[PDB]
Amino acid sequence: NLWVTVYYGVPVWKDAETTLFCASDHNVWATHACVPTDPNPQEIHLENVTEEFNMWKNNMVEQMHTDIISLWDQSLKPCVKLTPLCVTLQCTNVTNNITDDMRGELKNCSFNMTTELRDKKQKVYSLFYRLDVVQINNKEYRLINCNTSACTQACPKVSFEPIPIHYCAPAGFAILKCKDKKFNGTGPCPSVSTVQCTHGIKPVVSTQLLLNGSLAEEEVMIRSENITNNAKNILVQFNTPVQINCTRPNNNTRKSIRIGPGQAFYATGDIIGDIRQAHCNVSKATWNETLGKVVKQLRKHFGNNTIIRFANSSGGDLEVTTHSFNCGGEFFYCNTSGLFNSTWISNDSITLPCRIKQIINMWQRIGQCMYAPPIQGVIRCVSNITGLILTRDGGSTNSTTETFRPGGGDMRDNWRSELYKYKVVKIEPLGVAPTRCKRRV
Amino acid sequence: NLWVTVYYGVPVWKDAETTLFCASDHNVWATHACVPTDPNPQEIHLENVTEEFNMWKNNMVEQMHTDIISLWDQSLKPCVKLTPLCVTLQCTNVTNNITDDMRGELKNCSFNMTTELRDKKQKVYSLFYRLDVVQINNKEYRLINCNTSACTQACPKVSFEPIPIHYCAPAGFAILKCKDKKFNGTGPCPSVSTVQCTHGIKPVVSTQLLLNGSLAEEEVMIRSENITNNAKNILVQFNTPVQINCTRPNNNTRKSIRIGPGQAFYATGDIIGDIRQAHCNVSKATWNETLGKVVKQLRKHFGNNTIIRFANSSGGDLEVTTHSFNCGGEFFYCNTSGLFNSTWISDSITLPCRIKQIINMWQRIGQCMYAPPIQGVIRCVSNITGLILTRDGGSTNSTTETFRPGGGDMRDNWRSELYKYKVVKIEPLGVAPTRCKRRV
Amino acid sequence: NLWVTVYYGVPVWKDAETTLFCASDHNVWATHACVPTDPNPQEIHLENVTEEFNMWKNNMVEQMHTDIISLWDQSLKPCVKLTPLCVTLQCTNVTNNITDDMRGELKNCSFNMTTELRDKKQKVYSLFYRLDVVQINEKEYRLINCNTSACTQACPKVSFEPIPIHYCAPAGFAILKCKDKKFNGTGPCPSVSTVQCTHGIKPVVSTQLLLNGSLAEEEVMIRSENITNNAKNILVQFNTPVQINCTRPNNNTRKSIRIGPGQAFYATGDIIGDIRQAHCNVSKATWNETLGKVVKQLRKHFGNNTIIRFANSSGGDLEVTTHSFNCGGEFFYCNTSGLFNSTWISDSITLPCRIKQIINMWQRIGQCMYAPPIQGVIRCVSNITGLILTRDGGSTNSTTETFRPGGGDMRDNWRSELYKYKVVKIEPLGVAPTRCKRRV
Amino acid sequence: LGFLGAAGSTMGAASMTLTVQARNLLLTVWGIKQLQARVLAVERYLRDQQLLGIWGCSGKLICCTNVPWNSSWSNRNLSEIWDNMTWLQWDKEISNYTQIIYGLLEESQNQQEKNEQDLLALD
Amino acid sequence: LGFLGAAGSTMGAASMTLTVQARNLLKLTVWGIKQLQARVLAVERYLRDQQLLGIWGCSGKLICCTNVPWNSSWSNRNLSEIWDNMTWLQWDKEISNYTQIIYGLLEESQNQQEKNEQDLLALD
């Protein structure tokens, strides 16, 4: 009496992965390639739907990571390769209007550079930071990337502003947006909605802290695989952002040196006025309140009566031990020891020392660096902290106290805090069900 | 009681833009990359069809411009890049048989060039024109465009012959051809026909005069976006071609200089025989009758009793003030002041030309190519099929209109060939009412 | 009365060419890029059907040749380019524990090389063979590729092991596998089968001997495009493998020289043992019985009572006169005059071998790759599964036939593996009459 | 007449040439350029086929439906619509109202499907 | 309702809204090549589903009848709770293993139907 009927277009999805395409409203990320995004993003709420999500097993973070790396490598291709810059550098210390904090940080180098004519050289000079040069034993110096890999110089016409990009699913696929509040990294979501494209995600590269990210809806959320594992990083999301102001009062000057036919090297000229160390300011009251909220959530996860102690980074490279910035064109490396220094039981601002490096390896890759050319004028970087990347130590059987230190070593954690609400599924329109619908000859 | 009926395959089109694929019958335009053309193309006449055309808003010229740029860029890549040649040059004037015209035009430069061995140097000499060198700061010279980029030597195996090209529309698209005569490029066309592929379009690069183009149907046609607007170029199409014979009496000699492993620089050796100035013949009678036809056609737009006067180029660089040529491998730059010098009320012309090796054809900053010299005396025979004129602005001061040659846009050369075609989007779906009702 | 009917999905195929994607279970051939092969390759045996095959007119051989060339060119692009090495090399002979057969084969060269700094240079030493070194002044030598093209140093992390690859046809196409024995490569095959992917085709590069190939099923098979034509190479397939042991007991030492910023040049540092010539060992018993089977199969086509002689290579380049192959990374060039030296009527063979670093693969001019030295003793075991013979004519044949090895192109080597495969295009549409009238 | 030859003819005469119009709908950067248009034609043809399939007219060039023709769309009569004007003028006459009928046919075919299923299930 | 709106609804109400999902199923600048690959994959999936529907005799029909009886081993539940208490997700979960058998039975059932219709049509 029952015949298996065939239905097409049934609302059935299957968890899988695919190659998503970008959408935006030149930059390094080539948002000019991302297709346009309609001004009316469709968002249909799915009542009575309980879908299981997973932050760590999500494939969107890996795809976006590969896309960002590919866009960076493609953007550095039409620029100037700084291969003849690796020469013998005769550097001297810059003691003109220097401060006590900047003693030895900036070095005034002089070297023989090539000209447009292959039969003659030129005597030019430039200012390099201490982190960009190394002695080969005035003294003879050499860039730190000469013995590893000669890299290209970043094009000044191309900016590093992390404008948001929207990841959209192709035909036959859908993106499930979890609108449930107080939702951690895993577990089922009782409020799932569908969207054709994700929200505006800014590809901001940062270490130990999250900048210009998405804020929490109601309270501070602590996300990790499980708190029993110390090797897994702890992702924190703030509900109220705290303002952070980074700047450099040096007022640098850009000097153009034509090293060859059609290519030029943007060197650093003389410093205007006094030289002061780059710093960053964080409000003391807001940071204390945010640390109190984070301590409350960590106590809720680890049990009450725990002495939550915050410590600075343990050790390692400068990229994992310092906070990395990217705004205007100069890459910063700020010492965040003043923020993570407290102990919790039961107009003032924090000035953090900061350093600037020109030759960087932000993707933690050996053999492909990038030279950031200097920019003129005083840089004023104003942003807000929306999260942290903490790491807990062992602590042994002593559960009366726990030490939390900033973490890093993986850029995927920065984008994981933004893609926690999305998931890619495969729409399955074919379905079979019995009905009294039978064919007739 | 009426009901809508769904029809598929309805002959209805809509104006749109798409990427048309190439077709054609050792070439810079990559003949191998184009699919083989149809030996018997379909020419279907569409009776009772009136479609509007617009040669100025057509996307075919922009698409072919981008295609030509991409083909040239992909063609210059597989051959020798000449960065070793931006060195100091100790030049001197070659006065060995130089007519007083070609005095100072050729420099005998000497320089230290690299060789196959990186630790050895090779001292060689070559002949460079005055336009290709500039004084470094009286004996030291530097090749032009050295401070802007590094020119790429042209591939000798790759030829610069403008072979005919064919543009075909993909599936779901069609190309509408306007077969109506006396078409000024705008307005409705009473004779429209469809073709799967366009005719053989010659991508001849020229400035101020159209060469090797399609002749008119019956008379000279004047085309412009706005006749009253002097800021827009005036495209003139001839009905009868005007023969033009170009040549250079210099017996150039090619020298192969190995600048590195597998890379050779083709220099210019000593000239065999006397050195003469490169010129070009133009018949005076044919040019005068062609100018008379152009004046008669311009009087229909500007009214009668108007004093039409022809003047030379006002000013600018050599790319817009001289007529650019490309035949055999040498680029010419001829002084066209002898042609556009007349006043109209109610045996052969000789045009002096200059040779330039390092050139910026597409007016791009950072891209240049070095044209290597070719052996023996060359002869270039072609015909003029049109001009690119410009008019001087005036607030009705007098009844005299001055016409001068122009340029500044390479798309105007091909716009005189792509004016008869237009790309449309086929819409097979259609709805109409008929007395139908499906039986349940 | 009969009415036509439409059938969809009929088993009808037509011969055509297509782009067969590969299938495979850090590498030159980029195995990681290939799709994963099927763990259970389905093979449907087709009964009562006979398909005409053609080994010499197979498009899969040309497609495979282009694919291997493309992968080889793409694998050399991401690593070090050795342009800075064309310099004057003050060289001398090694003469340290040489064995008279290697008197001048190895040389100890010295030259000025750049360092990490652009303005700093250094003097380094390197061991170069006489095959890739030519004298430039009649003690000062240079590389043979200095006047041809700058070689590209092979990536040290990328291996040269020929791992098998499976060629699979896309949707709508099928690969017909002829499972019939005694097939000479041309003509009809009475036992075919449909396979979605071919078997493991190892891209082994070898000349005059088919190494690591597929063995015959019943007896030695001899295939040629035209037996009576001397210009056509004779392909022989063995039913049993002939083991060959090749080695290099020099025990080289690899050192890294900072050729520039971020790139290093791997050179042969020093020898820490007795210098001996490379050689390959082939047992004379198995080779004798294999040649007996080969001469029997040759007499089967050329008639009985005729003597057949085996001679070495006639002459020419070292790539065509010597058996060139790859063993562990180093490229060998062994003299096979000892194998083809006999005369038929009615211990181990030690073949002298030479090693070259600067090679020009695929017989191309203008593209070379420098093989970096490998430390340690290199030893490998291979299977001789076939030969590429060449025949010559004579006055009335004089009841004798001389066979010499043929150093043909790489297409003939891979043709011995794709002899039982062909590509057909499925045509599922068919019409046939049946007593059936559609209602109205 | 060939492809698109019946464009200037009347709609009644052009209705017999729908077969010739339906059959005509199907280095590295150049290959990508060509592949883009090659696949674009495929998506356009598949979108048209899907739109026809959801209307109950799959595989039929001339398929009349059950949606009533509103008088507000065109007060023009049948006698001067089929054998008097072309398809181009008709497209230019109902360009605004095309989406309305395209949307109405959706639920009309859906109701026909439910009703067929219910009447067959009751039997 | 919009796209996937009837996901949490019962099977009875989800049957009237299948047409919306039906119309919704259809390095050289990384975004371009990724979009091209995504478009080709989507076209392939849509064509595979359409071909699977065509060989079953349900071409161009969202809801169609068949002649294959519903085996009792597939599900021991009646139509009172399937169309009025169960959605499509859970339903797909229980019969995910029996999907191949059902597809094979529906594919073979068309051959007998075509042969029977051809025979009855030939006798006319």
Next chain:
Amino acid sequence: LGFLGAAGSTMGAASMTLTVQARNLLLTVWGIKQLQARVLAVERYLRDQQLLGIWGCSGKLICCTNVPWNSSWSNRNLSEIWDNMTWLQWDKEISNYTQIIYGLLEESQNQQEKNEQDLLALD
């Protein structure tokens, strides 16, 4: 039987195996090559489906048409067609008439559509 298993077998018995044959109809060196092959296969399947759609046989593996098949194409009787000849020999024999048959079927389907519309109109 698998893919193309009934190729060498005679007709009739090979007619029940049309489902197993229609199912298989659907920068790196291998990447662009695989993409081009996939697009080519998709276009071939779409061309065959378009031909079946314009013939009025969409969705039917064994479709019948109201077109007379006379002895001009082949003089052999119907018995040896299905019980003595395979499909390959049939293709090798009818290739000469295949094209005219396709056009005849297309025109017949267009005429059938027109008379169907007319019959539904006066009804």
Next chain:
Amino acid sequence: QSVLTQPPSASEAARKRVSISCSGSFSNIGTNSVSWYQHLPGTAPKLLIYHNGQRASGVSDRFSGSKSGTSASLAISALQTEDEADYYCATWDDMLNGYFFGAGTRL
């Protein structure tokens, strides 16, 4: 007995030209520069010719050096009375990794 073969002594009158030869191997002379030193009894040696063709500061124009592959030589044009000293030819040996002096030519 040792590298850098040099004659034990040389005798030649005044006002004319004398030549002192010094040959070695490929590792010492063929790939490295040769240096000449003059030594008198009681004082420290002084550098005369360096880089095979460069004269040291304070050295008269009479001294001259040259090198031809494996062999090297020192030319003393217009011999004088105070030229009676010991001349040593030295160069670096890449095979033994060290500086080696000649046998010493007593003028």
Next chain:
Amino acid sequence: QVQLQQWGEGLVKPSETLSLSCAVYGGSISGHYYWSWIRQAPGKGLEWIGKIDANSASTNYNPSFKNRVSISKDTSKKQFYLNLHSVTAADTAVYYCARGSIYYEDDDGYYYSEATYLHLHLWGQGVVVTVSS
């Protein structure tokens, strides 16, 4: 310009360690230089002993003094020492501490810093030693 002075023991008994000290005045222990030690016995020519790099801690010695000589460098007080263990009666020679420049500039803009262009410019005043009772 640059003066080098050395001091040591004039009479040394047989079989112990012989220590020699040389100092630099007017210059510095840095740059492309090779601080070496050269000795010559009465009747024999100049014989090289060893060397020490100025910009590195690496050192090389003559094979005739295999595992018997040691040379140290102290850049703090710009001095380099020479040590010869188990002095025999064949060590009576005048020891000289010399500086060997290893810098060379060719016709182009390149430079070389290696032992190929080694040449001893300056020499010490010389100190004699006696190996007897």
